[PDB]
């Protein structure tokens, strides 16, 4: 209730270091309005080590998805009948994409 | 209605007539081109001035020219 959320820090180069305002808590930066601090507080994140681990896991999953795109286009390309299974797509999305993720976040 | 004028630089490629959406142009026999065809406008009163014939002309500048003026019911594309 007294320290403004700040997560972007600038480099002192041409006088833009004045953008690093006194947000409180012995820190200088830009007051962020994304609400990421409140999201991390709602997720139980306490230390910066958990944020580091989440960032590394996000980079790993991003590389995995990028390789997955390369694989599912160049190596193993699904056919037209695979995409046209709208019933299977809807069932897997309702049960797995939305419901399973909801249960995992609930847990 | 509008004025459609066709000059002697036309090669008789019949692209302007195919591009015409109101059947204004026609092909007449000629001797000034290799294809022995010349564009004509016997139905210029039905032309609206859409300039679709000018897009299909392959020659430099334009072998067919549309000049707007004195719009009528047919020239304004009105269904009412």
């Amino acid at each position: 209730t007294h320290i403004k959320p700040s997560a972007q820090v600038v480099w002192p180069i041409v006088g833009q270091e004045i953008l690093n305002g006194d947000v409180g808590g012995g820190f200088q930066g830009i007051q962020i309005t994304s609400g990421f601090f409140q999201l991390w507080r709602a997720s139980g994140i306490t230390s910066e080590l958990q944020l580091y681990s989440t960032a590394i896991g996000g980079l790993v999953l991003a590389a995995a998805c990028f390789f997955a795109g390369w694989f599912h286009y160049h190596k193993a390309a699904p056919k037209l009948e695979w995409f046209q299974n709208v019933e299977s797509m809807l069932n897997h999305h309702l049960a797995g994409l939305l419901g399973l993720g909801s249960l995992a976040w609930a847990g | 209605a509008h004025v459609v004028k066709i000059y002697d630089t036309c090669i008789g490629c019949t692209q302007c007539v195919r591009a015409c959406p109101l059947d204004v142009l026609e092909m007449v026999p000629w001797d000034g081109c290799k294809a022995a065809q010349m564009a004509s406008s016997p139905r210029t009163e039905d032309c609206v001035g859409c300039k679709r014939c000018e897009t299909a002309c392959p020659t430099d500048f334009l072998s067919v020219r549309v000049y707007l003026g004195n719009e009528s019911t047919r020239s304004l594309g009105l269904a009412y």
Binding site: - | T9, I11, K34, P58, D60
Partner: protein
């Protein structure tokens, strides 16, 4: 007939037509018609016009040498 009604095929020409897109430009002669049409000189140009075409028919009096 005698010689040819136009320039040598494959030779560069300069277009003297003022209303053409390729005025004062160098093009290549593809073929010259011998029947007696108004514009027998078929010229292909390296740079296309706004319509995207690169060939045009010109008469005998609107072509010269590349200077």
């Amino acid at each position: 007939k005698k010689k040819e009604v136009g320039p040598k095929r494959g030779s560069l020409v300069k277009v003297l037509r003022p209303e053409s897109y390729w005025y004062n430009q160098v093009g290549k002669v593809v073929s010259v018609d011998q029947s007696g049409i108004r514009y027998p000189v078929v010229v292909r140009f390296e740079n296309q016009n706004y319509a995207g075409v690169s060939t045009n028919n010109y008469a005998l009096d609107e072509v010269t040498d590349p200077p």
